[model samples]
Target: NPNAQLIEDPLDKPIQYRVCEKCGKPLALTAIVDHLENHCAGAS
Candidate 1:
């Protein structure tokens, strides 16, 4: 399973995972680990 705890890497970069484009505006894959969720999969 995709365990989150094991996926935790001690790195510091803004280019996080889970990227999505809904609006016309193009978004680069540089969403922080937190806000990425708000615009990514619409999940909390």
Candidate 2:
């Protein structure tokens, strides 16, 4: 889903997680967080 709104972070950076290109909707943060946590769990 495409992002309904392109919100820049406080640091003026685009969010790392991109919206799905087919539909216009903000990507779910929970999914991103979960993915990141899973990915980092082995690193730390």
Candidate 3:
């Protein structure tokens, strides 16, 4: 299942995002958007 949230930057528009399938937690749209950039590159 995918859950989403909206994020609006000061100079940008609001963005919708999906929750992390691994952690069922809400993340900022930007974070969820770029999650693949560091999928397993860091510690949890």
Task: Give model 2's TM-score versus the native structure.
Answer: 0.24
- For all candidates in order, the CA lDDT equals 0.48, 0.51, 0.63
lDDT of 3 at 36: 57
* Over 4 Å off, model 1: 1-21, 32-36, 39-44
lDDT of 1 at 19: 35
* lDDT of each residue in 1-44, candidate 3, tens digit only: 33575565567567776766666556677787566566664335
Cα displacement (angstroms), candidate 1, residue 34, comes to 6.5
Off by over 4 Å in 3: 1-12, 33-44
Predicted candidate 1: what Cα RMSD to the true structure?
11.5
* lDDT measured at residue 34 in model 1 versus the true structure, 0 to 100: 39
In candidate 2, where is summed lDDT lowest over 10 consecutive residues? 35-44
* Candidate 3 TM-score over all chains jointly: 0.35
lDDT of 1 by residue, 1-44 (tens): 87665866777865634434453333456534334455544333
RMSD of each: 11.5, 14.1, 13.6
Q: TM-score of every model?
A: 0.22, 0.24, 0.35
Q: How high is the lDDT of residue 2 in model 1? A: 72
With candidate 1 superimposed using the best TM-score fit, by how many Å does residue 13's alpha carbon deviate from the native? 10
Clashing pairs in 2: 1-20, 1-23, 2-23
Best by TM-score: 3
* Whole-model lDDT, model 3: 0.63
